[PDB]
């Protein structure tokens, strides 16, 4: 049973410059805070910053 709230990065993404980070295809993303429509923000492979929520999907589904 998951600790709380989990989520899984389904496409790829790099990091813009600040306030961003990476992503990979089955890479094990943890979210946050919410933006405004489509930028989140988390803790993904170590690294923390934001992330396309369109590369991301919740463990609820």
Not at 11 to 34: D, T, Y
Not at 37 to 49: A, I, P, Q, S
Not at 55 to 61: G, I, K, P, R, Y
């Amino acid at each position: 049973m998951v600790p709380g709230r989990k989520f899984i990065a389904v496409k790829a993404h790099s990091p813009q410059g600040e306030g961003e980070i990476p992503l990979h295809r089955g890479e094990a993303v943890k979210v946050l805070s919410i933006g405004e429509g489509g930028f989140w923000e988390g803790t993904v492979k170590g690294r923390t910053g934001w992330f396309p929520a369109d590369c991301v999907e919740e463990v609820q589904m």
